[PDB]
Amino acid sequence: GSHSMRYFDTAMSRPGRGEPRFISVGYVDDTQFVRFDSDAASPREEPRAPWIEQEGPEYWDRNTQIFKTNTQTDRESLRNLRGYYNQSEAGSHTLQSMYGCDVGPDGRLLRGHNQYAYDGKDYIALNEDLRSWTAADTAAQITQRKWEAARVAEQDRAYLEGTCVEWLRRYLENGKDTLERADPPKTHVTHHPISDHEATLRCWALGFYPAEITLTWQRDGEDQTQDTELVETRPAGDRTFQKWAAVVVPSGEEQRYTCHVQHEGLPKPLTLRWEPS
Amino acid sequence: FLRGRAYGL
């Protein structure tokens, strides 16, 4: 049911003191299924998720290889970019990327993805036809010429239209227990008043799996927003998430409404109700 | 499975 595998590449570079740090994490739909890191915090404690071990040293050994050779290729990058904009060797800069493919459950490739970002600012991206580039500024135009000549587009597509795909369905198969799964919501609301007449009735949560947990302070029938002071979802630590919104209704028209949630796996909506339960 | 990026920007 709609699947997407993408990698988040990161070549943050440290100047002189040490070496450039290279991070490459993998996701499937949103499941971090592997993490590589130049700073191997303890011998290969590089998280690998459960359904990738059955891939003998064969897969991981070949995979761990690709990483190194890439980190060497984005060593060049970091120093070319520094050259394009002419920046001292003293500074520290960042090269990020997201490449991965989305497919329909039937197994066919819908779109290809591959973007880069230097210092946080989009630099160059592979277009939707997977055969052209879209340069941000005049520097990336230098890169573009480079890859147009190098046929780099072709190479990236070859991957996204093959290995990327031919390993997505596979990752979904082997690890179906976690990928094509859901999770129990759990959202214990709370009262908690404050000063005079303007109080608060924030909900809460124990998490789920994604985070699209839509906590809206409704208002009769029209989705209320202004009367809301909601804060961003701040995971939790036990591999779950939270979030809470803070409605400020009077002590006379208090429970003139109840907060909802809505989720994934669960069949019909679980329209919640604020009321000491 | 990672991509074999051979050419830098």
Partner: T-cell receptor, first 106, second 112 residues
Framework: KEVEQDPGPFNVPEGATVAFNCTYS??????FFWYRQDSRKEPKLLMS???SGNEDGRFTAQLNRASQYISLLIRDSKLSDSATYLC????????FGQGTELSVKP | AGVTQTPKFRVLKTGQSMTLLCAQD?????MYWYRQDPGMGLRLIHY???????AKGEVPDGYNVSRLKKQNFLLGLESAAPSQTSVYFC???????????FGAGTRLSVLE
């Protein structure tokens, strides 16, 4: 093993055409390269395959990544084409192939 | 213009010292030092992905190497001895382990 290439001296007639076969154990390989080494000198890049199939111009390169097949096609052979034709597979860190000789007979 | 590799030929007495020069013009960040024996495949000795740095492939031997400057890769044989009697190809090229460009090659014969 790793990269499995053709046997020995193939003696293709002049005007005729030739096809080579190269195979790779690592199924998840990436890019491929047909080099040409004139006995006895340096490998000169001839063909490169980043996708499924590459032409340009008298040389063709068919790549089925499913069956793991990469082939070289040399139509309208010249007596000059005679040389060892290395096959190179990238994926991971670029492994060379022993090679495949080839003597065009006049 | 091209990838120059000097010298073409050279005779060595075991224990003597020589150093092969491989210099390039294309501004390639990537260079390579390969060894090829008669009928035997291409063997990777060292490689450098930049103006410093260096790596493996088949090093445990009388091969060391320097990328002091970017234009050229030097292969040095401290104390020569068989093997090391072969033909060497240095190679460069933009892109990491992709298309590469070899020089004429150096035919080495070190004799007892």
């Amino acid at each position: 093993k790793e990269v499995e290439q053709d046997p020995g001296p193939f003696n293709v007639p002049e005007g005729a055409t030739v096809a080579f076969n190269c195979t790779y154990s690592n199924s998840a390989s990436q890019s491929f390269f047909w080099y040409r080494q004139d006995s006895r000198k340096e490998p000169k890049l001839l063909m490169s395959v980043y996708s499924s199939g590459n032409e340009d111009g008298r040389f063709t390169a068919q790549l089925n990544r499913a069956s793991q097949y990469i082939s070289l096609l040399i139509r309208d052979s010249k007596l000059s084409d005679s040389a060892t034709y290395l096959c190179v597979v990238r994926a991971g860190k670029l492994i060379f192939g022993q090679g495949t000789e080839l003597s065009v007979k006049p | 213009a091209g990838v120059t590799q000097t010298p073409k030929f050279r005779v060595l007495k075991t224990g003597q010292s020589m150093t092969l020069l491989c210099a390039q013009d294309m501004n390639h960040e990537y260079m390579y030092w390969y060894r090829q024996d008669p009928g035997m495949g291409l063997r990777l000795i060292h490689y450098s992905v930049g103006e410093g740095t260096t790596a493996k492939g088949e090093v445990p031997d009388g091969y060391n190497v320097s990328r002091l400057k970017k234009q050229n890769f030097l292969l040095g044989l401290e104390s020569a001895a068989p093997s090391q009697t072969s033909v060497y190809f240095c190679a460069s090229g933009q892109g990491n382990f992709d298309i590469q460009y070899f020089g004429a090659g150096t035919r080495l014969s070190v004799l007892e």
